Amino acid sequence: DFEEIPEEYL
Amino acid sequence: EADCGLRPLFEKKSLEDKTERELLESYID
Amino acid sequence: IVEGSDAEIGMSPWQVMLFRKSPQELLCGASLISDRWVLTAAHCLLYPPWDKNFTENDLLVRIGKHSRTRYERNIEKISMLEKIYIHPRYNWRENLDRDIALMKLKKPVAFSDYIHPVCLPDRETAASLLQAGYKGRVTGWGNLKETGQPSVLQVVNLPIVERPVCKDSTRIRITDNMFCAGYKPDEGKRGDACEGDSGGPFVMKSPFNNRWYQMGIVSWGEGCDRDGKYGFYTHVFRLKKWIQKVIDQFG
Ligand SMILES: N=C(N)c1ccc(CNC(=O)[C@@H]2CCN2C(=O)[C@H](NCC(=O)O)C2CCCCC2)cc1
Ligand SMILES: *[C@@H]1O[C@H](CO)[C@@H](O[C@@H]2O[C@H](CO)[C@@H](O)[C@H](O)[C@H]2NC(C)=O)[C@H](O)[C@H]1NC(C)=O
Ligand code: NA
Numbered sequence: 001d002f003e004e005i006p007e008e009y010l
Numbered sequence: 011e012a013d014c015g016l017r018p019l020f021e022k023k024s025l026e027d028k029t030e031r032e033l034l035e036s037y038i039d
Numbered sequence: 040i041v042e043g044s045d046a047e048i049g050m051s052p053w054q055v056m057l058f059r060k061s062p063q064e065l066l067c068g069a070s071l072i073s074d075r076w077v078l079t080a081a082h083c084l085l086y087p088p089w090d091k092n093f094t095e096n097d098l099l100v101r102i103g104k105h106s107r108t109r110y111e112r113n114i115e116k117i118s119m120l121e122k123i124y125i126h127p128r129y130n131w132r133e134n135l136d137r138d139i140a141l142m143k144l145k146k147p148v149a150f151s152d153y154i155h156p157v158c159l160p161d162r163e164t165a166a167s168l169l170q171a172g173y174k175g176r177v178t179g180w181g182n183l184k185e186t187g188q189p190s191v192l193q194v195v196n197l198p199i200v201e202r203p204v205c206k207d208s209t210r211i212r213i214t215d216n217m218f219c220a221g222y223k224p225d226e227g228k229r230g231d232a233c234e235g236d237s238g239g240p241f242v243m244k245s246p247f248n249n250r251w252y253q254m255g256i257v258s259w260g261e262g263c264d265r266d267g268k269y270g271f272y273t274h275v276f277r278l279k280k281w282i283q284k285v286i287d288q289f290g
């Protein structure tokens with residue numbers, strides 16, 4: 001249930 | 011560092027959080 | 040954290056969240072001790088009994104957070120791990136003796152109103168503050184109860200407990216590398232760290248120089264917030280020589 005993080009962080 | 015342990019939103023502004031006094035009051039010696 | 044309360048914004052700027060890449064989930068707490076070093080509990084990274092054995096690439100470090108699950112854009116900073124260092128004498132087989140580990144970040148993190156390092160104690164700091172009765176503060180995004188999950192970082196202030204009492208509350212062997220904290224049944228008040236809070240900091244504010252020092256690391260317990268039981272923490276000063284060695288050698 002964690003919001004997705006920017007893809008830049010692999 | 012020489013600035014370690016000093017919080018920007020509290021110690022740096024001379025503001026205290028709601029429960030740090032509870033800690034101080036427990037340090038009797 | 041059980042029986043604690045919502046933390047104030049910027050209350051624990053050194054609080055770090057160890058985040059597992061896949062599946063995306065909370066792995067543990069941790070703390071920022073410099074712009075490139077993060078301190079945590081060894082069992083957060085290595086624990087054979089539960090088939091836990093993470094490598095650098097398996098996780099991320101999220102600093103400056105408040106909300107547990109949300110991506111706090113423009114506030115939190117996410118860092119990758121360059122290298123993990125677990126205490127060579129960490130005892131995962133018996134009592135989690137020397138439950139401590141360091142993680143070097145690939146790039147230094149920039150400090151802000153929400154990101155700032157905590158101090159590590161020296162011998163005099165430890166001697167003066169590590170006394171039964173003296174209260175420390177534990178923070179984390181772990182379980183709200185033993186048997187659920189908080190919206191934001193939780194905080195609880197707990198008194199350090201006399202060693203004989205810590206010893207008499209468990210069948211587990213206690214070492215000088217750990218101390219326990221928490222209220223007694225008669226003291227009325229409650230509070231404890233819990234699953235998910237591991238690796239997080241137990242801090243105390245020096246009344247001498249008014250700086251926050253990390254005296255302990257959430258390590259273990261038997262259940263959470265149970266009457267007659269106490270939370271156990273890694274004694275940071277006792278293991279500072281190792282910390283200094285690792286940082287001096289690789290940083
Ligand atoms: N202060 C607390 N109440 C508390 C804080 C953090 C934690 C999470 N840490 C862990 O799960 C670590 C690795 C194994 N373990 C434990 O705590 C084990 N109990 C497992 C358990 O009681 O759930 C204990 C059991 C007795 C021997 C040492 C290991 C658990 C309790
Ligand atoms: C934990 O995982 C690491 C992988 O990061 C394992 O490390 C290996 O250890 C063996 C020795 O038993 C070496 O021969 C390998 O070269 C190491 N790397 C790998 C990729 O296997 C380690 O064995 C695992 N268990 C423990 C207790 O650390
Ligand atoms: Na005992």
Ligand code: NA
Pocket residue numbers: 221222231264265266267268269
């Ligand atoms: Na208890």
